[PDB]
Symmetry: C2
Subunit: 141 residues, 2 copies
Protein backbone atom coordinates (compact mmCIF):
# COMPACT_ATOMS: atom_id res chain seq x y z
CA UNK A 1 0.00 0.00 0.00
CA UNK A 2 2.37 2.72 1.25
CA UNK A 3 5.15 1.59 -1.09
CA UNK A 4 2.75 1.45 -4.04
CA UNK A 5 1.41 4.94 -3.33
CA UNK A 6 4.87 6.54 -3.23
CA UNK A 7 6.50 4.28 -5.82
CA UNK A 8 6.59 7.13 -8.33
CA UNK A 9 8.95 8.96 -5.93
CA UNK A 10 12.50 7.51 -5.92
CA UNK A 11 15.02 8.36 -3.22
CA UNK A 12 18.68 7.94 -2.52
CA UNK A 13 20.93 6.00 -0.21
CA UNK A 14 23.84 8.01 1.20
CA UNK A 15 26.91 7.71 3.36
CA UNK A 16 27.00 10.21 6.22
CA UNK A 17 30.46 10.77 7.63
CA UNK A 18 32.72 12.99 9.73
CA UNK A 19 36.12 13.06 11.36
CA UNK A 20 35.53 13.29 15.09
CA UNK A 21 38.67 13.75 17.19
CA UNK A 22 40.64 12.28 14.31
CA UNK A 23 38.41 9.20 14.24
CA UNK A 24 36.21 8.38 11.26
CA UNK A 25 32.53 8.01 12.09
CA UNK A 26 30.09 6.99 9.39
CA UNK A 27 26.72 5.45 8.67
CA UNK A 28 24.42 4.73 5.78
CA UNK A 29 21.05 6.49 5.52
CA UNK A 30 18.06 6.11 3.23
CA UNK A 31 15.09 8.06 1.86
CA UNK A 32 17.53 10.77 0.74
CA UNK A 33 15.75 13.60 -1.13
CA UNK A 34 16.19 17.31 -1.87
CA UNK A 35 13.59 19.40 -0.02
CA UNK A 36 14.64 22.87 -1.26
CA UNK A 37 16.82 23.79 -4.25
CA UNK A 38 17.59 27.46 -3.51
CA UNK A 39 18.56 27.66 -0.70
CA UNK A 40 19.75 24.03 -0.85
CA UNK A 41 18.36 21.68 1.79
CA UNK A 42 18.14 17.89 1.81
CA UNK A 43 16.56 15.19 3.96
CA UNK A 44 17.41 11.62 4.95
CA UNK A 45 16.22 9.07 7.51
CA UNK A 46 18.43 7.48 10.16
CA UNK A 47 17.48 4.51 12.35
CA UNK A 48 16.78 5.33 15.99
CA UNK A 49 18.89 2.31 16.94
CA UNK A 50 21.98 3.85 15.33
CA UNK A 51 24.94 3.99 17.70
CA UNK A 52 26.91 6.16 15.27
CA UNK A 53 24.29 8.86 14.59
CA UNK A 54 24.55 10.32 18.15
CA UNK A 55 28.27 10.95 17.48
CA UNK A 56 27.47 12.81 14.24
CA UNK A 57 24.32 14.83 14.75
CA UNK A 58 26.03 17.72 16.55
CA UNK A 59 29.16 18.03 14.37
CA UNK A 60 29.70 21.38 12.55
CA UNK A 61 29.75 19.73 9.12
CA UNK A 62 28.77 16.30 7.84
CA UNK A 63 29.83 14.77 4.55
CA UNK A 64 26.98 13.33 2.49
CA UNK A 65 28.21 11.00 -0.24
CA UNK A 66 25.31 10.10 -2.54
CA UNK A 67 25.69 6.40 -3.31
CA UNK A 68 22.79 5.92 -5.71
CA UNK A 69 19.10 5.16 -5.77
CA UNK A 70 17.76 3.15 -2.82
CA UNK A 71 16.84 0.06 -4.87
CA UNK A 72 20.20 -0.15 -6.66
CA UNK A 73 22.20 -3.17 -5.47
CA UNK A 74 25.52 -1.45 -6.19
CA UNK A 75 24.46 1.49 -4.04
CA UNK A 76 23.37 -0.86 -1.25
CA UNK A 77 26.76 -2.58 -1.46
CA UNK A 78 28.56 0.75 -0.96
CA UNK A 79 26.21 1.49 1.91
CA UNK A 80 27.24 -1.79 3.53
CA UNK A 81 30.92 -0.90 3.19
CA UNK A 82 30.26 2.45 4.82
CA UNK A 83 28.85 0.64 7.84
CA UNK A 84 31.90 -1.62 7.81
CA UNK A 85 34.48 1.03 8.76
CA UNK A 86 34.65 2.07 5.08
CA UNK A 87 36.14 -1.28 4.03
CA UNK A 88 38.09 -0.96 0.79
CA UNK A 89 37.08 2.68 0.35
CA UNK A 90 39.09 5.85 -0.07
CA UNK A 91 37.88 8.66 2.15
CA UNK A 92 38.47 12.39 1.93
CA UNK A 93 38.37 14.50 5.10
CA UNK A 94 37.90 18.20 4.64
CA UNK A 95 39.30 20.66 7.21
CA UNK A 96 35.75 21.15 8.47
CA UNK A 97 35.69 17.50 9.51
CA UNK A 98 33.19 16.51 6.77
CA UNK A 99 34.15 13.16 5.18
CA UNK A 100 33.37 11.86 1.70
CA UNK A 101 33.78 8.60 -0.21
CA UNK A 102 36.00 8.94 -3.26
CA UNK A 103 34.35 7.26 -6.20
CA UNK A 104 30.88 8.54 -5.44
CA UNK A 105 29.28 10.99 -7.90
CA UNK A 106 28.00 13.68 -5.54
CA UNK A 107 29.47 15.17 -2.34
CA UNK A 108 27.24 17.40 -0.19
CA UNK A 109 28.96 19.17 2.70
CA UNK A 110 26.07 19.74 5.08
CA UNK A 111 24.88 20.89 8.50
CA UNK A 112 21.86 19.61 10.46
CA UNK A 113 18.91 22.03 10.47
CA UNK A 114 16.03 20.04 11.95
CA UNK A 115 15.28 16.61 13.46
CA UNK A 116 11.77 15.10 13.10
CA UNK A 117 10.84 11.85 14.81
CA UNK A 118 9.28 9.25 12.53
CA UNK A 119 8.51 5.82 13.97
CA UNK A 120 11.69 3.73 14.22
CA UNK A 121 13.73 6.42 12.49
CA UNK A 122 14.38 10.14 12.53
CA UNK A 123 14.03 12.54 9.61
CA UNK A 124 17.13 14.71 9.35
CA UNK A 125 16.85 17.95 7.38
CA UNK A 126 20.17 19.62 6.50
CA UNK A 127 21.47 22.81 4.94
CA UNK A 128 23.89 22.13 2.08
CA UNK A 129 27.00 24.33 2.14
CA UNK A 130 29.06 22.90 -0.71
CA UNK A 131 28.36 20.58 -3.62
CA UNK A 132 31.13 18.69 -5.40
CA UNK A 133 30.74 16.50 -8.50
CA UNK A 134 33.18 13.82 -9.64
CA UNK A 135 33.33 13.77 -13.44
CA UNK A 136 35.04 10.36 -13.45
CA UNK A 137 31.96 8.83 -11.84
CA UNK A 138 28.76 8.09 -13.74
CA UNK A 139 26.07 10.51 -12.50
CA UNK A 140 23.15 9.23 -10.43
CA UNK A 141 20.01 8.71 -12.52
CA UNK B 1 36.28 16.96 -9.04
CA UNK B 2 34.39 20.22 -9.60
CA UNK B 3 31.98 22.41 -7.63
CA UNK B 4 28.27 22.50 -8.42
CA UNK B 5 24.82 23.51 -7.18
CA UNK B 6 22.06 21.37 -5.74
CA UNK B 7 19.90 22.86 -8.51
CA UNK B 8 22.22 21.44 -11.17
CA UNK B 9 22.80 18.00 -9.64
CA UNK B 10 19.10 17.45 -8.84
CA UNK B 11 17.34 19.12 -11.76
CA UNK B 12 16.12 15.88 -13.34
CA UNK B 13 15.08 14.58 -9.91
CA UNK B 14 11.34 13.94 -9.93
CA UNK B 15 9.47 16.01 -7.39
CA UNK B 16 5.80 16.84 -7.41
CA UNK B 17 3.51 19.80 -7.65
CA UNK B 18 0.47 19.49 -5.39
CA UNK B 19 -2.72 21.25 -4.48
CA UNK B 20 -3.10 21.94 -0.77
CA UNK B 21 -6.69 22.65 0.17
CA UNK B 22 -9.19 22.92 3.00
CA UNK B 23 -12.68 24.11 3.74
CA UNK B 24 -12.40 26.96 6.20
CA UNK B 25 -15.76 28.03 7.63
CA UNK B 26 -17.45 26.82 4.46
CA UNK B 27 -15.05 28.69 2.20
CA UNK B 28 -12.61 26.86 -0.05
CA UNK B 29 -8.96 27.80 0.43
CA UNK B 30 -6.28 26.28 -1.77
CA UNK B 31 -2.85 26.82 -3.19
CA UNK B 32 -0.38 24.98 -5.34
CA UNK B 33 3.09 24.11 -4.03
CA UNK B 34 6.09 22.40 -5.59
CA UNK B 35 9.24 20.50 -4.59
CA UNK B 36 6.85 17.91 -3.19
CA UNK B 37 8.61 14.75 -1.95
CA UNK B 38 8.10 12.01 0.61
CA UNK B 39 10.64 12.40 3.45
CA UNK B 40 9.54 9.24 5.27
CA UNK B 41 7.58 6.15 4.19
CA UNK B 42 6.52 4.26 7.32
CA UNK B 43 5.19 6.33 8.91
CA UNK B 44 4.50 8.59 5.91
CA UNK B 45 5.60 12.22 6.01
CA UNK B 46 5.92 14.57 3.04
CA UNK B 47 7.45 17.94 2.26
CA UNK B 48 6.74 20.87 -0.04
CA UNK B 49 7.82 24.49 -0.40
CA UNK B 50 5.53 27.49 -0.05
CA UNK B 51 6.43 31.14 -0.77
CA UNK B 52 6.57 33.38 2.30
CA UNK B 53 4.53 35.99 0.43
CA UNK B 54 1.57 33.58 0.12
CA UNK B 55 -1.64 35.11 1.44
CA UNK B 56 -3.42 31.77 1.27
CA UNK B 57 -0.93 29.68 3.25
CA UNK B 58 -1.53 31.43 6.63
CA UNK B 59 -5.20 30.54 6.16
CA UNK B 60 -4.27 26.86 5.76
CA UNK B 61 -1.28 26.14 7.96
CA UNK B 62 -3.19 25.86 11.26
CA UNK B 63 -6.11 23.81 9.97
CA UNK B 64 -6.69 20.41 11.64
CA UNK B 65 -6.32 18.53 8.35
CA UNK B 66 -5.12 19.55 4.92
CA UNK B 67 -5.95 17.82 1.67
CA UNK B 68 -2.90 17.21 -0.51
CA UNK B 69 -3.77 16.25 -4.09
CA UNK B 70 -0.71 15.22 -6.10
CA UNK B 71 -1.08 16.90 -9.48
CA UNK B 72 1.93 15.38 -11.21
CA UNK B 73 5.67 15.94 -11.66
CA UNK B 74 6.41 19.64 -11.14
CA UNK B 75 7.90 20.13 -14.63
CA UNK B 76 5.02 18.43 -16.46
CA UNK B 77 2.84 20.92 -18.36
CA UNK B 78 -0.43 19.16 -17.51
CA UNK B 79 0.50 19.28 -13.82
CA UNK B 80 1.38 22.98 -14.06
CA UNK B 81 -2.01 23.59 -15.67
CA UNK B 82 -3.73 21.91 -12.72
CA UNK B 83 -1.64 24.05 -10.40
CA UNK B 84 -2.77 27.18 -12.24
CA UNK B 85 -6.41 26.15 -11.96
CA UNK B 86 -5.93 25.44 -8.27
CA UNK B 87 -4.75 29.03 -7.84
CA UNK B 88 -7.58 30.36 -9.99
CA UNK B 89 -10.37 29.49 -7.54
CA UNK B 90 -10.25 25.80 -8.62
CA UNK B 91 -11.54 26.78 -12.05
CA UNK B 92 -13.04 23.87 -13.95
CA UNK B 93 -12.21 21.42 -11.17
CA UNK B 94 -14.33 19.15 -8.98
CA UNK B 95 -13.43 19.33 -5.30
CA UNK B 96 -14.25 16.88 -2.51
CA UNK B 97 -14.47 18.18 1.06
CA UNK B 98 -14.02 15.64 3.85
CA UNK B 99 -15.86 16.19 7.16
CA UNK B 100 -12.43 17.05 8.65
CA UNK B 101 -12.20 20.02 6.32
CA UNK B 102 -9.53 18.46 4.09
CA UNK B 103 -10.23 19.12 0.39
CA UNK B 104 -9.13 17.07 -2.62
CA UNK B 105 -9.21 17.48 -6.39
CA UNK B 106 -11.23 14.81 -8.18
CA UNK B 107 -9.27 13.27 -11.05
CA UNK B 108 -5.91 13.34 -9.32
CA UNK B 109 -4.39 9.94 -8.59
CA UNK B 110 -3.25 10.42 -5.01
CA UNK B 111 -4.94 12.07 -2.03
CA UNK B 112 -3.02 12.57 1.21
CA UNK B 113 -4.97 13.83 4.20
CA UNK B 114 -2.27 15.52 6.24
CA UNK B 115 -1.36 17.72 9.21
CA UNK B 116 1.53 20.19 9.46
CA UNK B 117 4.35 18.64 11.48
CA UNK B 118 7.17 21.15 11.07
CA UNK B 119 7.94 24.48 9.37
CA UNK B 120 11.53 25.07 8.21
CA UNK B 121 12.61 28.48 6.89
CA UNK B 122 14.30 28.39 3.49
CA UNK B 123 15.05 31.85 2.11
CA UNK B 124 12.04 33.37 0.34
CA UNK B 125 10.01 30.24 1.06
CA UNK B 126 9.23 27.69 3.74
CA UNK B 127 9.69 23.93 3.82
CA UNK B 128 6.49 22.37 5.12
CA UNK B 129 6.81 18.85 6.51
CA UNK B 130 3.49 17.11 7.08
CA UNK B 131 2.31 13.91 8.72
CA UNK B 132 0.04 11.91 6.40
CA UNK B 133 -2.96 10.43 8.22
CA UNK B 134 -4.97 8.99 5.33
CA UNK B 135 -4.03 7.88 1.82
CA UNK B 136 -6.55 7.46 -0.99
CA UNK B 137 -5.78 6.21 -4.50
CA UNK B 138 -8.17 6.91 -7.38
Amino acid sequence: SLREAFGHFPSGVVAIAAEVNGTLEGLAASTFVPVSLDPPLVSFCVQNTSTTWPKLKDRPMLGISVLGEEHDEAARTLAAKTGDRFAGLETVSRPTGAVFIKGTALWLESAVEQLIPAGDHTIVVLRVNEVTVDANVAPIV
